[PDB]
Every structure is written in structure tokens, then in C-alpha cells.
Amino acid sequence: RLVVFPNGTRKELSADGQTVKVMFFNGDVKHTMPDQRVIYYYAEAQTTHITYPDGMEVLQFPNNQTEKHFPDGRKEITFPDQTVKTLHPDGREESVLTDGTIIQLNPDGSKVIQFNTGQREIHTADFKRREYPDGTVKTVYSDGRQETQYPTGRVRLKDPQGKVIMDTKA
């Protein structure tokens, strides 16, 4: 079949019967497949939008970025530089850089960086903290004080000039 609507939109079945092809008057194009997958091209935005039956949506942008919308509410963005950012329903954003570094932006204002080496940096308004696989924690406060927590339970606190003001262990 070919149907041409009064507004000039055309609905045409592919010759082999499998693809329903709508050519909208505004330049948009929609193909609907036998599995009910819908592929929609938006002409002005030059964007492709695929809707799967299970509700997943994938958008492909002309800058080469991809955005995938999961049934669990996550949205995963693949930038043109290959960075993959995941937006979680609770507001966390987690970027995985190509070298595998993970950068997490959290709703509370913090930024957490998980390096390949196992080290983890936590940045808040009040401190910058580094965590190490053995359990060591070094924290530098906005006022310049520095705390080292050792794997043993020992906690050593220094003033901003480096003088020890607290050194405790159970």
C-alpha cells in the first residue's frame, strides 16, 4: 500500500512487506519493523530515535553521541570522545573515561574519583580526601589541617604548618 494523507504525509509498505515507512510532511521519517521496533528520524534535529517494545529508547545525535534510556530509569550517554556517563534516578552521575577512571558527581555536592590504581579521591566543600587500598586515608581540610588514618586504627592530625596536634590509637 501507499497512502498519501491530505497534508502530504506518505505511508508506504516496503516492497517485501516487512517495513512500514512513514514520510511525514515536515521531513521526519518513521520505520516500524516486524518486531514492533520503531525507528524515527527527526529532520530538523538530524537525530535518530529508536523505540524498542520493552520501552528502551536509544537516541543518536548528529555529533555522534548516543543516549540510551533504560527501563530502570538510568540514562547512559556515550560522548563522541568515547566517555560513557550514566545518570541514575537518585541524581548521581558516573562517568567512565576511556582509560577506566571513574568520576562520580553526587547530589550532596561531592565529587569522587576512582583511579585505575585503586586509589579513590573524595572532594567535598570541606575537605579533599584520598583513600588507599590498604585502608589508609589522608584528608586535607579547607583550613589546611591534615589527617592521616592508618590501616592500624592510628589517627594522626596535623595543623596547617605540619605540626602534630592529635595522635591516637586504641
Author numbering: 955 to 1124
Paste lines from the article.
Of particular interest in this regard is the putative centriolar CPAP–STIL complex, as mutations in both components result in MCPH. CPAP and STIL are strictly required for centriole assembly: STIL at a very early stage and CPAP slightly later, possibly by controlling the organisation and length of the centriolar microtubules. Instead, we demonstrate that the TCP domain of CPAP constitutes a novel proline-rich-motif (PRM) recognition-domain that specifically binds to a short target motif in STIL. Our mutational analysis of the interface demonstrates a remarkable correlation between the ability of mutant proteins to bind to one another in vitro and their ability to support centriole assembly in vivo, providing compelling support for our structural model of the metazoan CPAP–STIL complex. These data strongly suggest that the interaction between CPAP and STIL is a conserved, essential step in centriole biogenesis.
To understand how CPAP and STIL interact at the molecular level, we obtained the crystal structures of the TCP-domain of D. rerio CPAP937–1124, both on its own and in a complex with D. rerio STIL408–428. In both structures, the TCP domain adopts a nearly identical conformation, suggesting that no significant conformational change occurs in CPAP upon binding to STIL (RMSD = 1.5 Å ± 0.2 Å over 148 ± 4 Cα pairs). The TCP domain folds into a single layer β-sheet comprising ∼20 consecutive antiparallel strands connected by type I β-turns and is stabilised by an extensive hydrogen-bonding network. The resulting sheet shows a twist of approximately 13° (i.e., the angle between the consecutive, hydrogen-bonded strands), slightly lower than the average value of 20° observed for typical β-sheets. Individual β-hairpins correspond to previously noted repeats in the TCP domain sequence; the turns of these hairpins are often constituted by a PDG motif explaining the high frequency of proline and glycine residues in this domain. Crystal packing interactions involve only small protein interfaces, suggesting that the protein is biologically active as a monomer. Indeed both small-angle X-ray scattering (SAXS) and size-exclusion chromatography—multi angle light scattering (SEC-MALS) experiments demonstrate that the TCP domain is predominantly monomeric in solution. The structure of the TCP domain represents an unusual, novel architecture. The TCP domain structure lacks a defined hydrophobic core typical for globular domains, and both sides of its β-sheet are exposed to the solvent and well hydrated. However, what, to our knowledge, makes the TCP domain structure unique amongst naturally occurring proteins is that it solely consists of a freestanding meander β-sheet that entirely lacks a defined hydrophobic core and is not flanked by other globular domains that pack against it.
